[PDB]
Every structure is written in structure tokens, then in C-alpha cells.
């Protein structure tokens, strides 16, 4: 099954893999233009479970890893640079485990390598929400998204907040069978030992105020990877790449410029 993708520019290819609920579109407001300006070719796409595949259920991390590998193969861009956030970083991580040959280097944002407690609490709360059929009223849904994705410093800034709240109406997230199944595409065991075998250079970025995937969990992924290093962005919540795009793009671009394709 083909997944929608958007292909931009020419040059060294970078494939972006969004987190749970994110269409490939998530990368265009803040990442793609900056990468096109530094000379890369950018590929974004709709993970299984999103848009045209939003009714897909019963798929797994392995399915999604295969979807990603197939995309890289179908476009004849092996090995590609990869940028992943959360579920997307986990997909990248697992891709490097089974097909290290498709990936030259990667940036992994807001990631983790095991089924830690925070993740367990998140799994349960989200699954429960789905299984109850309860609809959160809109302002209450928007307030939770604010509290979970943004830093302290952002909530203090009355202009920004009015944009984030405007931004939420432009970015609806529909409760679908696909979104539910994406919830399972996360570590269920300790994957750190399997990451010890990944040769590729890797930047892990932790966001300082991230409550969904706390920063220290990315440091555990970076420590495991022989060629991994850890970097922390201050004043960024879980949507750090949207909230501090300059700091995060500068970090990724410096790292990708230091490394061979």
C-alpha cells in the first residue's frame, strides 16, 4: 500500500517521520523550507493511520518500519538522512535496527528506548479515553494540548497562546482507528540493547520542558548508540520543533553538515 508523500528539492535526501497523529504536513511550516535552503531534498509523508489510511488498524511498529523502508526504496534514496519525532523517532530507531543500510544518519527528537512509566501512564490514559467513547469539549481538549506540548515560557506569552489556540483549529486531530493503533507503535520492551548495535551517526534532541517524553529518556537512547550524542533545547515542550524552530533547525543542520551522505 502506497502512502501519500510530498517530495521537494534536489540533493542529499532527508526523510521526515512525524509523531502519532501528524501528517507529513507537520514538517512544512518550520522544517522543510530551512532544509531546502541548505540544499537538501526533503521527503515527508502520511504514516499509516493518517489521512487516506486513517481507518487502518492492527498494524504494528514493524509494519510502519516496512512502510518507511519501502518509501526509501521506492524513491531510490538509500541511504537517506532521517529526522523523526516521538513515534517517528521510534520508527527511525527500529529502521536502523533491521535495515541500517537505508539510513546514513538521523536526528531523533523527543524519543525513548524502553517502555518507561511515563509512557505506560500515557498509554493507559489515551487507550482509556478512546475506549470510553468520551468526547472532550473543545476548549478542554485545546487546554490539554497546550499543557502537554508547550514550555512554561510559551504559556506566559499572551500573543503566542492566542496563536497556539488559533493553530489548534487549523490542526484538528480526529480520534480514528488509525490514531488508536498508532498508540501501540511504541517500545513494549527495553530496546536500548538492540540500539547498541547501530553504527550510524545520530543526534538525539531532548526538549527541556517535555512532559510526554521527558528529556532524560532521549539521553538514555543517545548513551546506548555508539555514534549517538545528546542535545537539549531549553524552554521547549513536546512540540519543541514547532515552538523553537530556529534552535532546533540550527542543531539539526549543523549536525547533518558535519556528516557524510
- For residue 81, report the phi and psi dihedrals to the nearest 5 degrees: -70, 145
Q: Give the residues across from 233 on adjacent strands.
A: 207
Catalytic residue list contains 67: no
Q: For residues 261 and 12, give the distance between their C-alpha atoms in angstroms, rounded to a whole number.
A: 7
Give, as one character, the DSSP assignment of residue 54. Answer: T
| Residue 201 in contact with Na ion, rule: CB under 5 A | no
| Residue 228 in contact with Na ion, rule: CB under 5 A | yes
| Residue 113 in contact with Na ion, rule: CB under 5 A | no
CB of 157 to a copy of itself, least distance (A): 8
144 binds, among Na ion, a copy of itself, none (CB under 5 to 8 A by kind): a copy of itself
Q: For residues 82 and 61, give the distance between their C-alpha atoms in angstroms, rounded to a whole number.
A: 17
Kindly provide the b/e burial profile for residues 124-154, where b requires at least 16 CB atoms within 10 angstroms of the residue's own CB: eebeeeeeeeeeeeeeeebeebbeebbbebb
138 binds, among Na ion, a copy of itself, none (CB under 5 to 8 A by kind): a copy of itself
Residue selected from 36, 78, 146, 247 as contacting a copy of itself according to rule CB under 8 A: 146
Residue selected from 58, 76, 134, 257 as contacting a copy of itself according to rule CB under 8 A: 134
Binding residues for substrate: 20, 86-87, 119, 238
Residue selected from 158, 169, 170, 174 as contacting a copy of itself according to rule CB under 8 A: 158
DSSP string, 144-181: HHHHHHS-HHHHT-HHHHHHHHHHHHHS-----HHHHH
Catalytic residue list contains 158: no
CB of 224 to Na ion, least distance (A): 7
Catalytic residue list contains 28: no
Spatial contact of 256 and 105, defined as CB atoms under 8 Å apart: yes
142 binds, among Na ion, a copy of itself, none (CB under 5 to 8 A by kind): a copy of itself
Q: For residues 110 and 215, give the distance between their C-alpha atoms in angstroms, rounded to a whole number.
A: 7
> Which uninterrupted H or E stretch holds 187?
none
71-74 contacts at long range (C-beta below 8 A, 24 or more positions apart)? 71/3, 71/5, 71/15, 71/43, 71/45, 72/15, 72/102, 72/103, 73/102
| Residue 116 in contact with a copy of itself, rule: CB under 8 A | yes
Residue selected from 161, 183, 192, 247 as contacting a copy of itself according to rule CB under 8 A: 161
3 state DSSP class of 45 = strand
Say which of 46, 86, 104, 209 is annotated catalytic: 86
CB of 97 to a copy of itself, least distance (A): 25
Closer residue to Na ion (CB): 49 or 228: 228
> Which residues are at the interface with Na ion (CB under 5 A)?
225, 228
Q: Which residues are catalytic?
A: 86, 210, 238
Q: What residues make contact with a copy of itself under the rule CB under 8 A?
A: 116-118, 121-122, 124-126, 128-129, 132, 134-140, 142-144, 146-148, 152, 155-156, 158, 161-162, 165, 209, 211, 214, 216
Amino acid at each position: 500500500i502506497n502512502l501519500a508523500y510530498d517530495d521537494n528539492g534536489t540533493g542529499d535526501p532527508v526523510v521526515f517521520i512525524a509523531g502519532r497523529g501528524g501528517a507529513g504536513r507537520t514538517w512544512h511550516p518550520h522544517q522543510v523550507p530551512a532544509f531546502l535552503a541548505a540544499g537538501y531534498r526533503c521527503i515527508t509523508f502520511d504514516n499509516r493511520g493518517i489521512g487516506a489510511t486513517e481507518n487502518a488498524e492492527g498494524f504494528t511498529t514493524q509494519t510502519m518500519v516496512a512502510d518507511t523502508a519501502a518509501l526509501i526504496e521506492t524513491l531510490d534514496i538509500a541511504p537517506a538522512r532521517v529526522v523523526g519525532v516521538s513515534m517517528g523517532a521510534f520508527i527511525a530507531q527500529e529502521l536502523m535496527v533491521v535495515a541500517p543500510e537505508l539510513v546514513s544518519s538521523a536526528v531523533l527528537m523527543a524519543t525513548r528506548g524502553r517502555l518507561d512509566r511515563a509512557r505506560q501512564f500515557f498509554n493507559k490514559a489515551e487507550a482509556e479515553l478512546y475506549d470510553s467513547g468520551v468526547q472532550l469539549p473543545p476548549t478542554y481538549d485545546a487546554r490539554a494540548r497546550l499543557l502537554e506540548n508547550f514550555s512554561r515560557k510559551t504559556l506566559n506569552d499572551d500573543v503566542a497562546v492566542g496563536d497556539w489556540i488559533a493553530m489548534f483549529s487549523m490542526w484538528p486531530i480526529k480520534s480514528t482507528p488509525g490514531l488508536r493503533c498508532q498508540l501501540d507503535c511504541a517500545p513494549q520492551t527495553n530496546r536500548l540493547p538492540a540500539y547498541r548495535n547501530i553504527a550510524a551517526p545520530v543526534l538525539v534532541i531532548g526538549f527541556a520542558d517535555d512532559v510526554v517524553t521527558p528529556p532524560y529518556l532521549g539521553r538514555e537512547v543517545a548513551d546506548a548508540l555508539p555514534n549517538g550524542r545528546y542535545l537539549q533545547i531549553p524552554d521547549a515542550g513536546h512540540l519543541g520543533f514547532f515552538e523553537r524552530p530556529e534552535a532546533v533547525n540550527t542543531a539539526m543542520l549543523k549536525f547533518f553538515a558535519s556528516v557524510k551522505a
